[PDB]
Design a protein around this ligand. Structure first.
Ligand SMILES: CCCCCCCCCCCCO[C@@H]1O[C@H](CO)[C@@H](O[C@H]2O[C@H](CO)[C@@H](O)[C@H](O)[C@H]2O)[C@H](O)[C@H]1O
Ligand SMILES: CCCCCCCCCCCCO[C@@H]1O[C@H](CO)[C@@H](O[C@H]2O[C@H](CO)[C@@H](O)[C@H](O)[C@H]2O)[C@H](O)[C@H]1O
Ligand SMILES: CCCCCCCCCCCCO[C@@H]1O[C@H](CO)[C@@H](O[C@H]2O[C@H](CO)[C@@H](O)[C@H](O)[C@H]2O)[C@H](O)[C@H]1O
Ligand SMILES: CCCCCCCCCCCCO[C@@H]1O[C@H](CO)[C@@H](O[C@H]2O[C@H](CO)[C@@H](O)[C@H](O)[C@H]2O)[C@H](O)[C@H]1O
Lengths: 1030, 150, 100, 50, 50
């Protein structure tokens, strides 16, 4: 093949030419986004049952939907929460790979089947189902600089003016407005209603009466009378629109003729539909959108296009309305594409230098500069074929590939260059000659390397998706790199390199080059000697090899294992949980005594805060609060003291003084979509209807027990704790004995306190909702109900205090279920130096002290790691068995493959060393880096063995073959390692957007590169001679 | 999957024209084979549980889970789950001049699960400190609570 | 009972918001009639899998639906592939005029 | 075979919470023929290769 | 063009198809000359013939 293209430089060029076209036409049809879909795709089924309680929502809405959610493909598990704010969520979870659009539809279908089993009131609301991955492109926010508009207002706007166009904006996928449309609000007065012996229900039946578009048939329909000649639709009256028209829908008329308009009993004005959640921008009333990137879109292009579309709207936005972009993942994506095209560029520049310094000829310097770009273009096309994207992982996977790309080129060129020098052969002749030598080796190494990177891909789960990216892009480049090292480059060598006077090693050129060649020439002579020295006194060295090993292992059992690096996203979360019973007004401040604080005392690092009342990460309710502490670009806040991880410490301590509201700071997870990255996740479950309270004995025993267990730490239940709830007793005995129905009382308590969504009016075009419930000062305290009367048999208003009685008891503020039965989630983590695995171990024993009828099951990342964890042995052993078999084939020997496999440790020690020595962790970047570094290392070993075996077979004794082999291989190795280390240095010492990943990757290859280079150049010949001696 | 989506796509055009008592009963669309793969039964050890006790067990604890066990197309429970059955007596019923539609009605006004709102209710007045859930009417569970219906 | 103008302000316009952003969208054309009828026609590039564009269609509409008039939400929006041309008509004619 | 093994597994993750006078049994069941079928050919495979 | 500035236009159906077919044509011609060029410049080991 290679001798075929040496004689065919033009054909060889054509191949390269279509690799380049394919790759270029590919680099621009390719999706561009931060990450692929790591999280298991999940579907969220949602609804708010206004005025409802966690129990009504769970038993009336959630249970019934759960009872018909089944017969659905690739379903991993289901989980839901019913809340005190009448809202709920049911998230179904499928395998990674599940077709989202198909998974969704299977879930809304069976929702559809359940909908008629639901209370009429939830059915009317809707029940939105939607894809619930947390991969938000950016998140805007329409905040009012002043105080002119409220949270409710700003919302209707975004959905009146800002929404529709943004959807037509190229790239924009899913988005969520923090709020709904306007809702016509009617707040009934118990007093101004009792005075006309009127009840809320009179209003509802009434509102319905005087607000219903009537069909109104046709003026000439069919059949018709002979003739007519004129047919025309008849358009009747339309539904109410203005607050005034609503203040008009009369309820009754006094015998004196006087009439009672709705206005005569309550206020009337457009307002929010749901007030559960409150949100402010640095303290100002706010709303906003949360956008996702459409399938196949360009993260970068859409960000521009969003900001584009928004701008063309800013002019007409009311005075005080300020748009803003608190959170945007574009800066990290962009600062990752550069921070790769830059390293890629540098690599090819550095390679030129090392290529010159040593080879002292520009022509030879052109080759690597051709092939490396050819191959890099290819890979993209190859990824395009595969359906991958241009993401954080696929890119870094390119960076890692570089050592290997630069290597293939250097070896091919350096070795032709050398053959010409030793045998005075010509470019053409040398070129054939080299490729006769290597060539098998390279096919051999292409195989061995696939066998080192492919098994990762076969991991299931989440860690499987991450690794699959690195794996498929690394081995695509690799395989391409080889193809091009077989077709193109040898052809370029035969064509573009001038000859060398046999035996000319330039030790005469004088000057620098003159000095260098004598220096290196001596350095080599030194090395052959060391090697020759070692090959005499072997045992002692085999001996030391055992200490390299033992150190590796020991060094493994000491490095903190992690999922992914501790990235500094420009953000930090702050969870606020005031005392159980607290009103939103209270929580609103507990989150402000923070904002004012962050926004000011921490101006050095803090740009703006986005706070919320009602919502939290443990639950929802007035006692649940939170702040989204933004941060200004990495650049304008250097020095560890202004790291999100340092800002936290400060933020924390301040909040420390808070014997009145549980507050916490914590940098978000490395990959949001997954959340909890470190620790364990599980549900405690009542698999026998034992009951809430029992079940709660479990979560409390679990908690105060696991905390006696020196294997876990930070064990916190995730949901909320029961608070006091004001129960209502209704004595129907005195109800029927008072002429007051019983259904009228219920309608009274619902349509006045909880609220009632009655009708659909028409607001400036679109249709919105009419809401009817009691005016605030009528529903605040237990005595407020005493304020409400109901008509009797006749027309005697009967106060709620004449048959109803109060009573405080304990109840669930947040009910949860997991796989159909009630459940409670608990987090926490492993004790320092212990593994998530151990942690699950302790727990697998705790659980055994459970009450009867309570079970548990792992969820989320513990569910997953429990699956991937189990295949590793198998994968690791297939990797070894195929690398073995391929090297057996290459060397025609069952034993010689051992003399290159035993280099694995040699290089992995310097990685463990460097990474541990830098305080980093055994995470994703480190692991894949460790496969790259050991791949190159083994390529160095493989070729050495290969050369030696050749020398050996062409009639030279083993040790003499090993010495010559190493001497012939040294220049090649020094050049690729000299150039590969320097290429990575910039990652090792980077700062700014994404610098955390770049370190986790630079620190590992430098260490692995250094120790592996210097050690395999000494022990491989040892291994090789040591095993041939057996 | 496309089949099922197409049927149901049409099925939900009829649905509304269907009588309420049928919609309410929950319709099942399934994509499964004709043969039973198997059946899992349950039987009493100390012979203490009736046909009916084993059935409330299955549907109440096992059935769903199997409902979602990768691969189960559809299922049939040869039995049923409990139900709060109210056996109407036309003699006692004549005695007080009552009708089934009277008792069907009391059960709908007295065994309910109403939304009742709360004290700290939003939107609230400026100053409000306390907030708690108000649990009004709840669903019955025991024959006794139904027995005592007014 | 609503005018072509209602059919548009309270229906079509809303469903079109959900139709934006769908995979492989060429264009969408809707019509509002004075007999309470409407049609939103969503068109896709050749090669797009039509079973799957329908499903994306159902998935998006399900989020407009609650924002439709309860006179429609109880009704039932129809969703079907769009063939522009009839292949044939199979008529029926009475000779002796026995049937009208 | 998969869906049957999946079922033996969903129930076995439920037996521990089952009442007292109660055992799970398998009246009808189609998988066993299948296991027996190939297992019985595997059996013949070896006889022949021998 | 004689429309009240505010009212634009946009092709569709048959037309849409037309305005696309036009668009393709150029690159179709470019790339097609390329494939013929490279295939000849490789099947005859030269640049002169192609
Ligand atoms: C950087 C982090 C930023 C976090 C920002 C979070 C702020 C979110 C504030 C949301 C305020 C509430 O906005 C909420 O919108 C949802 C729809 O999505 C509405 O949902 C309401 O109408 C929808 C239909 O449109 C019904 O299906 C639902 O049952 C009903 O509750 C709520 O009535 C409204 O209260
Ligand atoms: C399902 C398919 C899976 C296939 C996996 C098998 C992987 C095979 C790896 C490629 C090995 C090719 O190896 C090829 O043959 C022999 C080795 O026996 C070698 O040929 C050798 O012969 C002579 C003398 O014997 C030596 O001077 C020298 O070592 C070399 O020239 C070459 O190094 C190579 O051209
Ligand atoms: C020339 C190119 C060569 C390079 C290509 C080499 C690819 C590497 C092959 C591994 C892919 C096989 O896929 C892998 O199979 C093994 C063995 O059945 C599975 O392992 C499964 O069975 C084994 C054996 O009972 C169990 O110990 C293991 O825990 C279980 O998960 C893995 O879960 C699956 O991921
Ligand atoms: C020209 C260059 C060519 C280079 C391209 C090479 C492509 C190789 C990619 C292989 C993809 C493997 O696909 C992946 O398999 C694994 C392991 O079986 C699956 O994982 C699954 O398999 C096994 C079953 O035995 C289970 O133990 C595991 O829990 C389960 O989830 C992944 O869900 C799937 O996505």
């Amino acid at each position: 093949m290679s001798k075929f293209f040496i004689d065919r430089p033009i054909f060889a060029w054509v191949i390269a030419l279509v690799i380049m076209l394919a790759g270029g036409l590919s680099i621009l049809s390719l999706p561009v986004n931060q990450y692929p879909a790591i999280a298991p795709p999940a579907i969220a089924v949602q609804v708010s049952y206004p005025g409802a309680s966690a129990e009504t929502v769970q038993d009336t809405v959630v249970q019934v939907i759960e009872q018909q959610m089944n017969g659905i493909d690739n379903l991993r598990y289901i989980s839901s929460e019913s809340n005190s704010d009448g809202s709920m969520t049911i998230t179904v979870t499928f395998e990674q790979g599940t077709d989202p659009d198909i998974a969704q539809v299977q879930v809304q279908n069976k929702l559809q089947l359940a909908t008629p089993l639901l209370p009429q009131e939830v059915q009317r609301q809707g029940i939105r189902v939607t894809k619930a991955v947390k991969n938000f492109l950016m998140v805007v926010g329409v905040v009012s600089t002043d105080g002119s508009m409220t949270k409710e207002d700003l919302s209707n706007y975004i959905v009146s003016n800002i929404q529709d166009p943004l959807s037509r904006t190229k790239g924009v996928g899913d988005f969520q407005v923090f709020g709904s449309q306007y809702s016509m609000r009617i707040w009934l007065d118990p007093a101004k209603l009792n005075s006309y012996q009127l009840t809320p229900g009179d209003v509802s039946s009434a509102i319905q009466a005087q607000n219903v578009q009537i069909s109104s048939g046709q003026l000439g329909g069919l059949p018709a009378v002979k003739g007519q000649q004129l047919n025309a639709t008849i358009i009747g009256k339309t539904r109410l629109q203005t607050a005034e028209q609503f203040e008009n829908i009369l309820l009754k008329v006094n015998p004196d003729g006087s009439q009672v308009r709705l206005k005569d009993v309550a206020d009337v004005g457009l307002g929010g539909q749901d007030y559960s959640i409150n949100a402010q921008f640095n303290g100002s009333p706010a709303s906003g959108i949360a956008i996702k990137l459409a399938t196949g879109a360009n993260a970068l292009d859409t960000a521009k296009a969003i900001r584009q579309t928004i701008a063309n709207l800013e002019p007409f936005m009311p005075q005080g309305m300020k748009v803003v972009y608190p959170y945007d993942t574009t800066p990290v994506v962009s600062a990752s594409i550069h921070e790769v095209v830059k390293t890629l560029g540098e690599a090819i520049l550095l390679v030129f230098l090392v290529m010159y310094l040593f080879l002292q000829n520009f022509r030879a310097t052109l080759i690597p500069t051709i092939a490396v770009p050819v191959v890099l273009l290819g890979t993209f096309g190859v990824l395009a074929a595969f359906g991958f994207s241009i993401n954080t992982l696929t890119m870094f996977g390119m960076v890692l590939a570089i050592g290997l790309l630069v290597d293939d080129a250097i070896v091919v060129v350096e070795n032709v260059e050398r053959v010409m020098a030793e045998e005075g052969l010509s470019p053409r002749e040398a070129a054939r000659k080299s490729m006769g030598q290597i060539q098998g080796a390279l096919v051999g190494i292409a195989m061995v390397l696939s066998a080192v990177f492919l098994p990762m891909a076969f991991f299931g789960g989440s860690t499987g998706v991450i690794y699959r990216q690195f794996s498929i892009t690394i081995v695509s480049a690799m395989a391409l790199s080889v193809i091009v090292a077989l077709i193109l480059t040898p052809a370029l060598c035969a064509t573009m390199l001038k000859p060398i006077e046999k035996g000319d090693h330039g030790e005469h050129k004088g000057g620098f080059f003159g000095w260098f060649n004598r220096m290196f020439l001596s350095t080599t002579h030194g090395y052959e000697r060391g090697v020759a020295s070692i090959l005499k006194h072997r045992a002692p060295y085999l001996l030391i090899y055992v200490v390299i090993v033992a150190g590796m292992i020991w060094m493994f059992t000491r490095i903190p294992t992690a999922f992914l690096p501790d990235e500094d996203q420009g953000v930090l979360f702050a969870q606020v949980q005031t005392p159980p019973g607290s009103s939103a007004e209270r929580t609103q401040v507990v989150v402000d005594s923070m904002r004012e604080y962050l926004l000011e005392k921490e101006s050095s690092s803090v740009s703006s805060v986005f706070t919320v009342t009602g919502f939290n990460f443990a639950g929802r309710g007035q006692s649940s609060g939170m702040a989204f502490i933004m941060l200004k670009p990495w650049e304008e806040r250097p020095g560890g003291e202004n790291s999100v991880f340092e800002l936290a410490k400060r933020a924390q301590m301040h909040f420390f003084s808070f014997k009145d509201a549980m507050v916490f700071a914590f940098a978000p997870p490395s990959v949001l979509e997954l959340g909890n990255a470190t620790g364990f996740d599980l549900f405690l479950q009542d698999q026998a209807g034992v009951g809430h309270e029992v079940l709660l004995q479990a979560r409390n025993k679990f908690l105060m027990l696991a905390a006696q267990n020196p294997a876990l730490q930070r064990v916190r239940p995730n949901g909320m704790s029961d608070e006091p709830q004001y129960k209502l007793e209704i004595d129907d005995e005195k109800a029927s004995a008072l002429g007051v129905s019983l259904a009228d009382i219920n309608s009274t308590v619902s349509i006045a306190w909880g609220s009632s969504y009655v009708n659909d009016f028409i607001d400036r075009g679109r249709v919105k909702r009419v809401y009817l419930q009691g005016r605030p000062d009528a529903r605040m305290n237990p005595d407020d109900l005493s304020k409400w009367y109901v008509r009797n048999d006749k027309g005697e208003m009967v106060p709620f205090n004449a048959f109803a009685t109060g009573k405080w008891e304990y109840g669930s503020p947040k009910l949860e279920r997991y796989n159909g039965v009630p459940a409670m989630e608990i987090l926490g983590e492993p004790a320092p130096g212990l593994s998530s695995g151990d942690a699950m171990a302790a727990v697998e024993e705790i659980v055994k002290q459970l009450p009867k009828g309570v079970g548990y099951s792992w969820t989320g990342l513990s569910y997953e790691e429990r699956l991937s964890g189990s295949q590793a042995p198998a994968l690791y052993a297939l990797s070894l068995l195929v690398v073995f078999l391929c090297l057996a084939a290459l060397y025609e020997s069952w034993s010689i493959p051992f003399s290159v496999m035993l280099v694995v440790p040699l290089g992995v020690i310097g990685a463990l060393l460097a990474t541990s020595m830098r305080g980093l962790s055994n995470d994703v970047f480190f692991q894949v880096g460790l496969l790259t570094t050991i791949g190159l290392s083994a390529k160095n070993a493989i070729l050495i063995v290969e050369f030696a075996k050749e020398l050996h077979e062409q009639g030279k004794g083993i040790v003499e073959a090993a010495i010559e082999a190493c001497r012939m291989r040294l220049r090649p190795i020094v050049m690729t390692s000299l150039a590969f280390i320097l290429g990575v240095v910039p990652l090792a010492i980077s700062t700014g957007a994404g610098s955390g990943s770049q370190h986790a990757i630079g620190t590992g290859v430098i260490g692995g590169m250094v120790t592996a280079t210097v050690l395999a150049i000494f022990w491989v010949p040892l291994f090789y001679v040591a095993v041939s001696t057996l």
